[PDB]
Amino acid sequence: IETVPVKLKPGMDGPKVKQWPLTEEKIKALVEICTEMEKEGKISKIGPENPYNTPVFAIKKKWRKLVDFRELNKRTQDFWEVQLGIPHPAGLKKKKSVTVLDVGDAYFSVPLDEDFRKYTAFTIPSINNETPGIRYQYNVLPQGWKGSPAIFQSSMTKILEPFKKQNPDIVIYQYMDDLYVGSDLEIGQHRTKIEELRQHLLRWMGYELHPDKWTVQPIVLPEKDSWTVNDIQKLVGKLNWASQIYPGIKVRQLCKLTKALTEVIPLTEEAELELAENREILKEPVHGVYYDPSKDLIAEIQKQGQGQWTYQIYQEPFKNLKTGKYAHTNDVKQLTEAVQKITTESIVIWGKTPKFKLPIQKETWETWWTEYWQATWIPEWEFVNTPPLVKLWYQ
């Protein structure tokens, strides 16, 4: 009833993003969706006097509508972030178990500031442009808009008030459409608290995450036991790159050991003293790297072949906040999953999504990414030319 005045950042203008071509099957599923939604007053047809647009897709998870408010969000950030921003607890990441609950389907209660509805306009396209295309706008909090949770906090806090009080050691975090609720309780106990929580939500298990048990992806060096020029050359090679991270790495003694490539040579007693210590480092956390809440997070992913994928997250090239790995599967299917996993962890850790650098062709990603996507958010992404040696130094 009571609407919260929503104002697009002074100056900036609505989003005007074109709709991506969709497959017949998804289109069909969107209309059926968008027919029910207007039938129950969640969205309304609109006319040409509305020059705005945001893209929509269909995912399965039973189809589900998914709007890409990436742009609208970038143009209202002041609202959701510095106006009604939700604080992120550092405790979440420390709990044995974290469950992710889909609570999006509740924004449809609260109405949206009429004066703001025209920015939430989207389009359902048609095959081969044989018909104009069905235009809509939301008349209630839309699911993928960072503004919704912002506006929906008073209700959310009241709903949780009791549960929290009766369970003062449970951390509950909200980030777009989702609740992250973690605890240090034993398996079964945790799941009982989640079910006991779901019931609270009702009057207005599912996804087992285990963050506390997340640790660095240590850059390892070959064990070997014979070593060759090539071997030691590659060995120092990555030791060089590592030099740019992990202060202390010393390739000097190695590098001091014309000659054929396939010529086996015995390291120097002094040699082991090097990669030994260098080994002891790399496994220990980086020194001097700190998350800066005002800087955006970057994420690179490289393809390791064999269904393996490595990844780093950072705010400044080469200084890593975190690195890890991920194991009908195809390149694009595995990569989509990688992107989903890394993002969940980012949110759990910093309360924000990283901007992705994708080792793929823009068109190829754009054609397929939706096929395997399941999350209800969409991170920013870029497309890059995986540096040949960068892939190898993280193997």
Added chain:
Amino acid sequence: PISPIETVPVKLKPGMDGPKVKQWPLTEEKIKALVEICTEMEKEGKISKIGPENPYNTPVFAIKWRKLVDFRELNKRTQDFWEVQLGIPHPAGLKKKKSVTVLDVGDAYFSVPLDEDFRKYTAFTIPSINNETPGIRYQYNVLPQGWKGSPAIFQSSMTKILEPFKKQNPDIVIYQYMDDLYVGSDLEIGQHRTKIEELRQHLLRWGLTTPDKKHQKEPPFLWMGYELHPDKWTVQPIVLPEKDSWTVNDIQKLVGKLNWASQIYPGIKVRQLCKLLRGTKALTEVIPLTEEAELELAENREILKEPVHGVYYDPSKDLIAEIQKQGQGQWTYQIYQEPFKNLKTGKYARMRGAHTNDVKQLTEAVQKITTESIVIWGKTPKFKLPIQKETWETWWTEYWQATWIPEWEFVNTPPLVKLWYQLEKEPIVGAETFYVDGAANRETKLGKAGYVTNKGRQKVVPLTNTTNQKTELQAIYLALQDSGLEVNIVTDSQYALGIIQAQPDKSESELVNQIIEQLIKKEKVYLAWVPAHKGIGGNEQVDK
């Protein structure tokens, strides 16, 4: 007439007011034309004599007799509308219909009501025989010709009013393009004509009048460069008369016409004709037609000898897309449902990248076809490619970039796509090791490209006027020359490693193209990388 359709609320931009530019008095006659015209329109209800003093006004003038209002000012001050230009169906995406008809709407813009609260903004004046007496004031009651919301509000109107009939006749197909309506159906002529009068009559109930028996209807239709029959489609007829002299202008238009035709005409070539355009070209210079092109024009003329039509789409049948390697960089493809009865034809010939190999290009083509097939048919085609599934998985697996082709299968239409060489994954045993490197003065713009060996050898061809990078591919090149059929090379240049490490088989760089051919003659090559200025045995010696 004027449709009773509810209007669309129009508004001016954020903080702007109605326009107010003054009238450049006209000439005796133009004044007379304007009065005759307005009076009629005025009788039609399209306009109204405005009283008091609307401070707003937009210029008006006559052209020979018709009236053109200058709308820039009001336009700029008018809001933005939902784009009416999102895409236009490709004929190959159309289902087959038994009967087609085309009704054109007369006085469309003028038959649709403007928003009353906005009418006041469209005020104009017919001058007096010379800035003496006020003049006849007029505002619009309907969408004005030059206004920016007209195309949009019209298309929205025509849809809202067309919605009810569609709903009571879902089996029927109607497409609106500007001032026309194409109506198709599977009804037999007799019964189809009834269905149309039913439309016209529904359309009249809403203020839109149509051609009685003038129905421009009755196929061979000309729409957006296409020729449309109810059963088949093709591109609009194109001639290429004889000429002994070709201007940039001429071959421009030829290239364009060729490209358009290549949409249904299999095997259209314009690569050789595109060269002739290379260089800063004055549109009126005669350009002698080279040999490679001399023939290409007539072999084009040849395939355009007998007309060709594409078929329409059958929703209950897989699409088949097959692709053909055709010359260098050039690719071609066809799309059909029943073997060799094409729906549409096409080609792909580009670069966007500095260095590339057939296997990558093939994938790019498949990609482009994949998204073209989506927008048109709403589903993905089944592919037939000139590549062994094995030779695809190898590359697929080893490459550092992700990929994913839809369902495909091998087809032996030479030439076949393949890698022209494979770099060793492990150091070669008992074969010259070449520590190579390059240099260059950033000021003198010259440098030395050399190499040293595990066998004593040493060189250094000096180069004049090369960047700091060339003298790195030059070195690797030099090494691939003085070495035997079997070798391994050490660089400190990741620039060169990346290039060669992706098995290029063609590049827009004469140096890289040489290194290529060289890589194809060897029987084993291994390229390893070591840090620069890190005094590594071998690299250092060559650095000196």
